[PDB]
Amino acid sequence: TRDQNGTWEMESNENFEGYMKALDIDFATRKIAVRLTQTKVIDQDGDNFKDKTTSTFRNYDVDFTVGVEFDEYTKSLDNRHVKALVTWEGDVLVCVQKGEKENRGWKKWIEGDKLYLELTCGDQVCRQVFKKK
């Protein structure tokens, strides 16, 4: 329909890297620009268009079920096709990601009203705490 009025949120960006390569875009900006998602608001009027694009960092999404190994390609970091399996050790979520790096995984649990997530790769561990809001 000729009507494009409304606010539109990006759902998929396909071959944005290849499109930028055809535009003689250097490697530096391309790697960050792909990480981005945009939301378009399009005021229209017969033939007159006003299009406002706002850019934000993309949305990293991991969708899984406990106990089943699923193939997840981490497009938000190093795009590796790790086969991730998450298990319950009590009520704490421990995940092991089969890949090139050893002892690679993460742990997610809750303490009252704060969420603790520890990402582990080798001997290094990053501890993040989240507040519900």
Residues 52-91 that bind a copy of itself (CB under 8 A): 52-67, 76-78, 80, 86, 88, 91
User: In this chain, which of 85, 93, 94, 96 binds a copy of itself, going by CB under 8 A?
Assistant: 93
Task: Return d(Cα 56, Cα 12) in angstroms, integer.
Answer: 14
Would you count residue 98 as binding a copy of itself (CB under 8 A)? no
**Which residues lie closer than 8 Å to 25 by C-beta, 6 or more apart?**
33
Under rule CB under 8 A, which residues in 104-123 are in contact with a copy of itself?
108, 110-112, 114-115, 117, 119-123
Task: Return d(Cα 57, Cα 34) in angstroms, integer.
Answer: 9
Q: What is the CA radius of gyration of the chain?
A: 20
Nearer to a copy of itself, 36 or 73 (CB): 36
Nearer to a copy of itself, 12 or 71 (CB): 12
Is residue 13 classed exposed, middle or buried when 0-12, 13-18 and 19+ CB atoms within 10 A define those classes? middle
Under rule CB under 8 A, which residues in 3-32 are in contact with a copy of itself?
3-4, 6-16, 18-29, 31-32
For residue 91, the minimal CB distance to a copy of itself (Å) is 4
Identify the three-state secondary structure at position 27.
helix
